[PDB]
Amino acid sequence: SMSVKKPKRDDSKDLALCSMILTEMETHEDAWPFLLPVNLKLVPGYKKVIKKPMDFSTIREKLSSGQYPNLETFALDVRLVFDNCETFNEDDSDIGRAGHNMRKYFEKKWTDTFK
Question: Where is the Bromo domain?
Answer without folding.
Answer: 9-113
